[PDB]
Structures are given as C-alpha cells and as structure tokens.
DNA sequence: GCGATCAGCTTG
DNA sequence: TACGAGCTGATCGCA
C-alpha cells in the first residue's frame, strides 16, 4: 500500500513544526559540496516532500532548520549537516540520529540506511537505499515519484522508531550516551570534516618527483639482481622470482602461491640481497601510490584543501574511522614516509598545527578496570610502563633492563591489552609458543589483578552476552559460546580488548566535546582539524600556541577520572610534520 | 567491459 | 600478522 503525502511546490507553516523528522537526501557517498536531492518532512500535521531548490531559497524554511528550538529527528545527520554547511546554511535542532542510536544499540548489525535500522525493531514499510539507487555504474537518482516516496518512507520510519529505540538504549543505559556524547561530537566532525586540512601540493610533487627516482633506481637493482625484468608489485610473479629461480627457502604460503609478506621477507633477507631492496621498493612504492598520488587525487584543486569524512558509525569498539583520504594512517613510523606530513600546513597565514596525544591511555584505563595495585603504582609514578613490566617480568633492577628485554616486555603489553594468547605472542616476538606461555605466566605474577580482570571479563561476556566501556557502548559477543576453539578464543579476544580500546575512544571523544566548549568559551580561533584515536590536531594563529599548551593538555586530562592520572603530551610546528 | 576479492601496504 | 581500521595494484570473476 502507498504512502500518502504532500508533493508541495511552496514550503509553508504546517511544515514548520517545532518537531519533526527530517529527510535531506545527499546521496553522493562524500558528502563534500554535494548536491541535496530532496527534502522530506514527517510531524503532526503530515507528510511532505520538498524539491531542494524551493525550499533551500525560502527564508522560513532555512530558518527552520537554523532554529534550535523546533526538534529534527534524522538518520546521518552529520551527512545533512555538512551537505548544508557547503551552501551556506546551518542545522540545528538535531534531536535525535536514529544512525547513532543504531550504532550504539548495535554496532554488529552494520545499519548504514534507515531500512537495516527499521528492521531491527520489525519495520520493513521503507526500502533499502542500494535497492531505491542502484551500485556503481548503475547508481543513480530515480525520477520524482520514485524518489519522493523513498523520502518520505524514510522520515515517516525515523518519525516511527525514534521512541522504540530511545526506549531500548535508556534500558541499556546508553540514553546519555547518544544524548551527550555522540550527537554532539557529530556536530563537532561535522565542523572538522568542513574546515579540512589545507595541503601542500607543491610539497607534495616535488616529493614524488625524488621518489620517481628513487623507485626507478631500486627497480633497476631489482631486476639486475634478479638476472631478469618481472612486475615486482606481483606476489605470483614476485613469488616465482623469490623461492623458484632463486631457490630462497619457503616458510609460509597463502593460496594461490607463495606468501611475500613483508614478515617473510625480513626472515629471508640474510639469504640474498634482492629481498632487502624489494622491502626497500614496496616501501617507496605506498608512498608514492598512496600518499603522493592518492592524496593529490582527492586534493580540492581551488582550495588545496582535502577534507576526509569521519565514518562515526562503523567500527565495533566506538573508534572512529576515516575516508577519502584515511588521515588516520599517514606514515609517521619511517622517517621517509613521516616527511609525507610535511605537506599537511596550516590554512591561515601565520597560524600552526598544535597536536596532542595520551599517553599511554589504554594501559591506564587498564589499572583503571582491573585495579591492579602494580600497575596503578606504575602510571602513579609515572614509569616507563614497557622497562617496569620488563623488570617485573624478568625479575632484574631498573639498570639491569636491556634495550631487547624492554622490546619483549613491549611486546607483551601490546599482547595483553588485544586479548592475550601464547601463539599471538609467540608469532609477534618469533619465539615458540611455550616460551610465549612463560613471558605471559610472568606477567600475570606480576599483575594479578589483570589476571582477573582478564578472567572475570570473559566470564562476563558469556553470563550477559556483551561487554560494556566507562560510558556504556556495548559490544555484543555471541561467539563467546562457541565449541569452536578458533571463534571462542577469537570472541575471548574481544572481550578482553573492547573494553579497553572503547573505552579510549569514549574518554578522547568526551575530551573532544569538552575541548569545543573551552575553545568557545574563550573565544579562540583555534579549531580541531583531526583526530586519531588517542590524539587531537588542531590549527591556530600562532598568537594561540602559549594558551592552547595549557589549556588542551588540561581538557584532555581531565575529560574523565581514573583511579590513575592521565597524561597528555603536546607539540606545535609550521607543519604536522613539525608539531613533533 | 565491469566489479568483487586477494595480498600488500599504512596507522593507533 | 594478535585488537581496531582504509587504500591501491594485481588478478580471478564472469556478464
Ligand atoms: O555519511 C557517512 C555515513 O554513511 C554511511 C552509510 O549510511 O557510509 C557511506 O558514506 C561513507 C563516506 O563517504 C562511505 O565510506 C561508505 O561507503 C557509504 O556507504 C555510514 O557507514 C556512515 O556512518
Ligand atoms: O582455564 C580457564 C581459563 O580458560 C579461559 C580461556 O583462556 O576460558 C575457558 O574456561 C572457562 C571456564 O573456566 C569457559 O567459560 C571458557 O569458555 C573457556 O574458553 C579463561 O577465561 C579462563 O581463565
Ligand atoms: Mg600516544
């Protein structure tokens, strides 16, 4: 049966409730300076479908949206509201996103439109997105009667199901949480997603100029190496190269062929010299196709700005996630690829990037959980957590920690806080999985009350079925159950780890809010640019560094308290580079 | 021809 | 290569 609704060619009062569901359709994947399809709007009084060049021009309707006090309820509104900021106009009143109230109810079932959302609560009067657009080369926008339906499901679904699913996150105790937290962080993404980040591309060209070179040289020490000329970005050819007609030895395969991983590679590099300089050509080889070129892709050409576009509702911890570009994993690790960052400058003349990071925030929200006396002492004295888990661990004083014990003991912390087990540990440190077993008995000597933190949350996971964060994301872990070794001791894991890394995202996300009022309150210029799961980038005038060095660290560290301190380091520069 | 999947890389 | 992500060149898919 069809929905009825007015297709209005004027907007007036009736559509200007002070509560509604909102539908502005951006259909686009990026959001960016894109076109707004179509407007829908659910209340009191009716169903109504706008053409976006009518209602976009009338005063009242864009001084509905810009009105706090009349109520919208939307899915995505972030898409909406960044959509609007590249026109000029501003939303408010957003009330409530049945995109984040999915996401926290969820965030397994991967809801990405209003259909997979409705579903969860038996509504199925609206269809799915892909099915109304089509994928790909196919995508598109249908004609008006089709369209406006589509819109007008969509809102009359949001005006349906806000209820049900503010119900059931207030039984989860996550009301505040999409109230406090999530709505307004996508407010504030949304501002960060819209100011971008300005770009270097003279910068940029030059580097890919030398590294042209570069490649080119190594290339040609390939192939002379090799005793012939192959597709060196092709593990079969590279393969047959490697372990056929240069015998090297084979210890470990994938499927189609041989395995050239680069952890293969570095086992192999003491049998010949080819594999050091194929390590050296894949390097060179994702800076250049990633970071030079990819990034000069996205680069808008009038501003030399790019702006990514921060996914708030994907990942299965409460971490965020970046897109075209990923500013979430520019190289910073090798000093060649950490001068990628040198490109990333500020968008004002005589302005600086300020950024600042915890330190150490998921070992410290760990002696947080689990109360454990050794390791709250650690971060109360504020040790050097990887040499004191060494000296714990291999029972020596401070002095007589080696460079490599600290490697290793290192390499436990990072075992423990993603769900600790002997094979993971044995193949991170290439040891054997009983000399893994005994680093980790160690370690639980040491840490008890890590012990049964680690014991008592997987016990957790299985009575209620979910593990929870500080602020109440839930993470729902049915394979906890599981006669399957593999899965259950993948779902152990799990519980293990989301607890700590969610609870990470929660306490940077509320220092992000936070952060914004302070900012606000004072009048400053500055504003966050990017955020990058334990660290804040922001960009400011240079008259600002003085004040942002005292006032950042402070928000950040005080965004929540923990049974231990939290720290926060900082620095500043003329590039992302610099601010090191 | 196209798009989906594999294998490699990058980050916290 | 453990936990959580995204991008790109090569290649198996077949319409
Ligand atoms: O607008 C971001 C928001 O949209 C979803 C779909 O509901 O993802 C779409 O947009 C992303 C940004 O361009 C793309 O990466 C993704 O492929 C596209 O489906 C949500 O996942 C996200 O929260
Ligand atoms: O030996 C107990 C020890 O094993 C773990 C897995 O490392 O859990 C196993 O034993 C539990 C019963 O004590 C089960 O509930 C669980 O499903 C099984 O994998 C640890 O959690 C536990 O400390
Ligand atoms: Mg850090």
Same mark, same amino acid.
């Given at each position: 049966?069809?929905?009825?609704?007015?297709?209005?060619?004027?907007?007036?009062?009736?559509? *200007?409730?002070?509560?509604?569901?909102?539908?502005?359709?951006?259909?686009?994947?990026?959001?960016?300076?894109?076109?707004?399809?179509?407007?829908?709007?659910?209340?009191? !009084?009716?169903?109504?479908?706008?053409?976006?060049? $009518?209602?976009?021009?009338?005063?009242?309707?864009?001084?509905?949206?810009?009105? =706090?006090?009349?109520?919208?309820?939307?899915?995505?509104?972030?898409?909406?509201?960044?959509?609007?900021?590249? &026109?000029?106009?501003?939303?408010?009143?957003?009330?409530?996103?049945?995109?984040?109230?999915?996401?926290?109810?969820?965030?397994?079932?991967?809801?990405?439109?209003?259909?997979?959302?409705?579903?969860?609560?038996?509504?199925?009067?609206?269809?799915?997105? =892909?099915?109304?657009?089509?994928?790909?080369?196919?995508?598109?926008?249908?004609?008006?009667?089709?369209?406006?339906?589509?819109?007008?499901?969509?809102?009359?679904?949001?005006?349906?199901?806000?209820?049900?699913?503010?119900?059931? #996150?207030?039984?989860?105790?996550?009301?505040? *949480?999409?109230?406090?937290?999530?709505?307004?962080?996508?407010?504030?993404?949304?501002?960060? =997603?819209?100011?971008?980040?300005?770009?270097?591309?003279?910068?940029?060209?030059?580097?890919? &100029?030398?590294?042209?070179?570069?490649?080119?040289?190594?290339?040609?020490?390939?192939?002379?190496?090799?005793?012939?000329?192959?597709?060196?970005?092709?593990?079969?050819?590279?393969?047959?190269?490697?372990?056929?007609?240069?015998?090297?030895?084979?210890?470990?395969?994938?499927?189609?062929?041989?395995?050239?991983?680069?952890?293969?590679?570095?086992?192999?590099?003491?049998?010949?010299?080819?594999?050091?300089?194929?390590? !050296?050509?894949?390097?060179?080889?994702?800076?250049?196709?990633?970071?030079?070129?990819?990034?000069?892709?996205?680069?808008?050409?009038?501003?030399?700005?790019? !702006?990514?576009?921060?996914?708030?509702?994907?990942?299965?911890?409460?971490?965020?996630?970046?897109?075209?570009?990923?500013?979430?994993?520019?190289?910073?690790?090798?000093?060649?690829?950490?001068?990628?960052?040198?490109?990333?400058?500020?968008?004002?003349?005589?302005?600086?990037?300020?950024?600042?990071?915890?330190?150490?925030?998921?070992?410290?929200?760990?002696?947080?959980?689990?109360?454990?006396?050794? #390791?709250?002492?650690?971060?109360?004295?504020?040790?050097?957590? !990887?040499?004191? $888990?060494?000296?714990?661990?291999?029972?020596?004083?401070?002095?007589?920690?080696?460079?490599?014990?600290?490697?290793?003991?290192?390499?436990?912390?990072?075992?423990?806080?993603?769900?600790?087990?002997?094979?993971?540990?044995?193949?991170?440190?290439?040891?054997?999985?009983?000399?893994?077993?005994?680093?980790?008995?160690?370690?639980?000597?040491?840490?008890?009350?890590?012990?049964?933190?680690?014991?008592?949350?997987?016990?957790?996971?299985?009575?209620?079925?979910?593990?929870? $964060?500080?602020?109440?994301?839930?993470?729902?872990?049915?394979?906890?159950?599981?006669?399957?070794?593999?899965?259950?001791?993948?779902?152990?894991?799990?519980?293990?780890? $989301?607890?700590?890394?969610?609870?990470?995202?929660?306490?940077?996300?509320?220092?992000?809010?936070?952060?914004?009022?302070?900012?606000?309150? =004072?009048?400053?210029?500055?504003?966050?640019?990017?955020?990058?799961?334990?660290?804040?980038?922001?960009?400011?005038?240079?008259?600002?560094?003085?004040?942002?060095?005292?006032?950042?660290?402070?928000?950040?560290?005080?965004?929540?308290?923990?049974?231990?301190?939290?720290?926060?380091?900082?620095?500043?520069?003329?590039?992302?580079?610099?601010?090191?």
């Amino acid at each position: 049966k069809k929905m009825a609704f007015t297709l209005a060619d004027r907007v007036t009062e009736e559509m *200007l409730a002070d509560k509604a569901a909102l539908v502005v359709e951006v259909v686009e994947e990026n959001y960016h300076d894109a076109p707004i399809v179509g407007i829908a709007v659910v209340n009191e !009084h009716g169903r109504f479908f706008l053409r976006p060049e $009518t209602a976009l021009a009338d005063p009242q309707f864009v001084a509905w949206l810009g009105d =706090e006090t009349k109520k919208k309820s939307m899915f995505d509104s972030k898409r909406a509201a960044v959509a609007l900021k590249w &026109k000029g106009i501003e939303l408010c009143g957003v009330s409530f996103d049945l995109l984040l109230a999915a996401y926290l109810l969820d965030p397994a079932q991967g809801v990405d439109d209003v259909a997979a959302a409705a579903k969860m609560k038996q509504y199925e009067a609206v269809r799915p997105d =892909e099915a109304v657009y089509g994928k790909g080369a196919k995508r598109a926008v249908p004609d008006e009667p089709v369209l406006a339906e589509h819109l007008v499901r969509k809102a009359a679904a949001i005006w349906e199901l806000e209820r049900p699913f503010l119900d059931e #996150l207030r039984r989860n105790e996550q009301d505040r *949480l999409l109230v406090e937290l999530e709505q307004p962080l996508s407010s504030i993404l949304a501002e960060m =997603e819209f100011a971008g980040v300005k770009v270097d591309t003279k910068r940029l060209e030059q580097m890919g &100029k030398e590294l042209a070179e570069q490649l080119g040289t190594v290339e040609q020490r390939i192939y002379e190496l090799a005793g012939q000329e192959f597709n060196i970005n092709s593990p079969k050819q590279l393969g047959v190269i490697l372990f056929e007609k240069l015998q090297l030895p084979v210890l470990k395969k994938t499927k189609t062929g041989y395995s050239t991983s680069a952890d293969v590679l570095e086992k192999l590099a003491p049998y010949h010299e080819i594999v050091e300089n194929i390590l !050296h050509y894949r390097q060179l080889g994702k800076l250049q196709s990633t970071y030079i070129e990819g990034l000069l892709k996205v680069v808008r050409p009038d501003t030399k700005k790019v !702006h990514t576009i921060f996914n708030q509702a994907l990942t299965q911890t409460g971490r965020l996630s970046s897109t075209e570009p990923n500013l979430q994993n520019i190289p910073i690790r090798l000093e060649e690829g950490r001068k990628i960052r040198q490109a990333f400058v500020p968008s004002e003349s005589d302005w600086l990037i300020f950024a600042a990071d915890y330190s150490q925030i998921e070992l410290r929200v760990l002696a947080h959980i689990a109360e454990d006396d050794n #390791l709250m002492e650690a971060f109360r004295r504020d040790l050097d957590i !990887h040499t004191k $888990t060494a000296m714990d661990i291999f029972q020596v004083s401070e002095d007589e920690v080696t460079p490599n014990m600290r490697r290793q003991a290192k390499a436990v912390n990072f075992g423990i806080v993603y769900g600790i087990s002997d094979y993971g540990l044995a193949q991170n440190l290439n040891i054997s999985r009983k000399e893994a077993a005994e680093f980790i008995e160690r370690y639980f000597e040491s840490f008890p009350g890590v012990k049964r933190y680690m014991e008592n949350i997987v016990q957790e996971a299985k009575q209620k079925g979910y593990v929870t $964060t500080l602020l109440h994301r839930r993470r729902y872990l049915p394979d906890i159950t599981s006669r399957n070794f593999n899965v259950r001791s993948f779902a152990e894991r799990m519980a293990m780890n $989301t607890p700590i890394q969610g609870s990470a995202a929660d306490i940077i996300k509320k220092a992000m809010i936070d952060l914004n009022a302070r900012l606000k309150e =004072e009048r400053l210029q500055a504003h966050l640019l990017l955020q990058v799961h334990d660290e804040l980038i922001l960009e400011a005038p240079k008259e600002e560094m003085e004040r942002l060095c005292r006032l950042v660290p402070e928000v950040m560290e005080q965004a929540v308290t923990l049974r231990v301190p939290l720290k926060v380091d900082y620095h500043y520069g003329s590039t992302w580079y610099d601010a090191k």
